[model samples]
Target chain A: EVPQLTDLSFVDITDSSIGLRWTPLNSSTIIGYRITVVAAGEGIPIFEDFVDSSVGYYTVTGLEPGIDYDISVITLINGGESAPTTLTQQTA
Target chain B: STSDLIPAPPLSKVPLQQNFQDNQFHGKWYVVGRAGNMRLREDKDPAKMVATIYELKEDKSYNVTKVMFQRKKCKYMINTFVPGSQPGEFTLGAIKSPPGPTSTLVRVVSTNYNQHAMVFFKHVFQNREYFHITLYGRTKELTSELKENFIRFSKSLGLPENHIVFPVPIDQCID
Candidate 1:
């Protein structure tokens, strides 16, 4: 099995936007990444995005204030995807 | 006593870096990736990193220092690398130095002084032999090509898929 993402961190968190960072995967087979943000208990997505392999950071905007959400990053490879690395945070 | 065996490539078959330059290779390096028989619970342990500095002595031996964070404190270990007959090949001279059980031999399998290096390690204890591979980078982050090269090399040595790890970056021990 390939290695998972590491050093996941929050660069900035605000009522409406969340800035994120993580250690990039070293595998050449990686083609891109998928990010999803959903409400903590409601199980509804508020934001989602796809980024290329070279990117190690991203920012999600237009979020509701004072709410908890689950942010997940998934690695997309040639034939499959990795288990998501998720973090839970409440917007400021 | 019955003994369990660990998988390792035959040392005789392992090749050293061609035309390895000692002068160019002397400097600081970040150990960004590791793989071997000594498994680490990276998921449970907090993120940590290791930085090493090498200084060449008059006799072509190297004074090596490795720094890392553990138990909420930065730890430093010092050792020496006695040069082998071939350039880029070395054996850790200090007895009981930290890193593994007891490293019997070390080889600079591949390196390009300015950016990255791939090193092979052999350890022995109670007649049990273990092997490990490490990827060193000039900076904390390295290119995908170099990372892929490390994985390929480790697999070639018969390391299990789950044995490899790219430790998360931590800033405490860099100095």
Candidate 2:
């Protein structure tokens, strides 16, 4: 089943880092999330992390100052990877 | 006269501007552009950019701090420049610390004190020589005419006309 992650947003942004959070989807069957961070226009993964149903937020680090980025969070449920919910933020 | 705005180089026998108010000039300045010899023109991430600060003291001498940063490693350094014999000039080390080897000559060619400032400097050291003009704006954005004024003055100092470069502005520096 397709589930939409809610409240996917950036709370704080610095020159090379950003703060991200979302509403967690409650699940008893199984729950996991895959996070992907990419530099805007550059087709390479700069940072990647993971979370579970117990967590609903992350802080992406090591981004370049004064640059743009594409961040996404994908939910993993019942042993399958769901489509990612993405957002964009530029470091201060 | 307007002629006072120009200072003779090599040794700076004459200071850059005929008049300068130290009290008003004390503050932090953002990196705007380089008029010539942009050796620091590496592909630095914008978040790692540096800013300069002039800490004024009672003796009319001020302390200068350059907050520098490095990419990929998140390294930071605070380089210092102390007061020189004249206004608009500085020596690169403090007496409390080890004596430095290089002297920097500054000429505040122009500035309104509220919006933007144009600064010219020269360094002739045994290892290498450096020459450049920096455009410092009170805010990140500068007016076009002020930018043009800096260009004309820098070129008058025999700097290459094409050497001027604007650094990407980052609001507030981060380590």
Candidate 3:
């Protein structure tokens, strides 16, 4: 069995954009993952995406000017989900 | 008549300064106005209007290209810095002519750092006239404080409030 995600990292944040990258603990059992970007004021994720295989990078666009956004990412396994990793970034 | 547009003081008569070589002159500049026939195109489109701002590069070469309009077009213009006679005044001119009646320099009145907009005045036929005021920023959008500063600067220049044209945000088509 593949181990759950043990480590995660938030790379960089800018006035207008944010970048996130992470390393997966289980390379074989894990098929893909999902990333969600939510505005600070909004309850639901403004954007969500799924990446297959070893892809581990995502960028959110059309963000409000000079606003902050909360982001979270989840790892997908044998029809299961790991705990979500979250962070915040501001845009200008 | 139209001859009064250019100031009579010869380019040599105006004191030249080397201050422009500093980082202050670099970055974006909004188009306030022009002399001969370089008026802003009226396409009723925000993309076209955003293309009017010029970017001054470190190499002294400037560009007036933005995706809002089309591909970036490069042009060469001679830049001359003139020391202002008093405080709160600095003049930068792009000279494309020689000592004579054919000489022309597009002058700018910088009220603050390049962060605020600059007033663009052209010398035509010996008279100095009100041209256009340009707003620029290191980034595409201006900070709230910078925008307020530009507004106050323009008001000090005796420009009517209604004449100010705030730029509309351009949609992202690059993605």
Candidate 4:
């Protein structure tokens, strides 16, 4: 490993959705990114998704209103994996 | 006892990060990917993630918090990483989540402190080894080459290509 993730964050949050972005692991060919979501204060995950390496933006949905979720982001270099970055957030 | 927690001795053949120190390594870490990464690709709605935080105690131990979104809330598991016989290694105890009679093992295989970190973890119970490998970065803005660097390193340590998974980011604890 070489570095930690860029500061992960959200631009907008709603009753059941959020807008988020991530930094690349480094400059290289990306296969894509993987995301996992769980309700706050627990270890059991609730959702998981993927994004193309070319895109850095995402909007997660199908969540409960007025709840918080823990999110994880992973980078795919070609076909390899990167450590994940996590954060906690509440829906509006 | 011998003040040890595991039934086996420290694993050999793997290298540790050089010039290792607890003070510099103390902080939050996200699990960017894992040896089980590839296998979980199709499983939607995994548990929410929590970044691990390490606070160096004056006793030369680490106050560790592993957070996760479980059962409708952000759950925290309190634990500690006590130093092993070698640098960049630790024996984990005081677990709160994923609780069991098992022993925990950790290895800081690679890290630059400023940008990325690679770690390997093992859970031993009933003589079985459950391995987990993770990569950490200062920011999600990582280059592709850096991702490959550690992924290849994992394979050399016997992590199966199918067991790896790259994770997505969350905004819960970004600050």
Chain A (alone) TM-scores for all candidate structures: 0.92, 0.89, 0.77, 0.81
What local distance difference test score does each model get? Answer: 0.71, 0.59, 0.44, 0.64
lDDT of 2 at B153: 70
Query: Please, what are the lDDT tens digits per residue for candidate 4 over residues B1-175?
Result: 0111212223664568888877888888776666622223334565555577778899778888876654445656566788887888887765332223256677888888777788777654332334566777766556688788767876776656665557675656445
Give the runs in model 2 whose Cα sits over 4 Å from its true position. Answer: A1-92, B1-15, B38-49, B72-80, B94-100
Clash pairs, candidate 2, are: A65-B47
TM-score-best of 2 and 4: 4
lDDT of 1 by residue, A1-92 (tens): 54568777876899877887987887898887767664442212335567798999988776655655567887878666766778767677
DockQ (CA atoms), all models: 0.01, 0.01, 0.01, 0.07
> Which candidate should be chosen as best, given DockQ against the real structure?
4
| Model 4 TM | 0.56
Off by over 4 Å in 1: A1-92, B41-43, B46-49, B94-103
In terms of TM-score, which candidate is strongest?
1
Docking class of 4: incorrect
What's the TM-score of each model vs. the native? Answer: 0.60, 0.51, 0.35, 0.56
Cα RMSD (Å) between model 2 and the true structure? 17.1
Provide the lDDT at A83 for model 2.
Answer: 61
In terms of docking quality, model 1 is: incorrect
Instruction: State the displacement of the C-alpha of residue B12, model 1, in Å, after optimal TM-score superposition.
Output: 3.8
Give each model's clash number.
0, 1, 11, 79
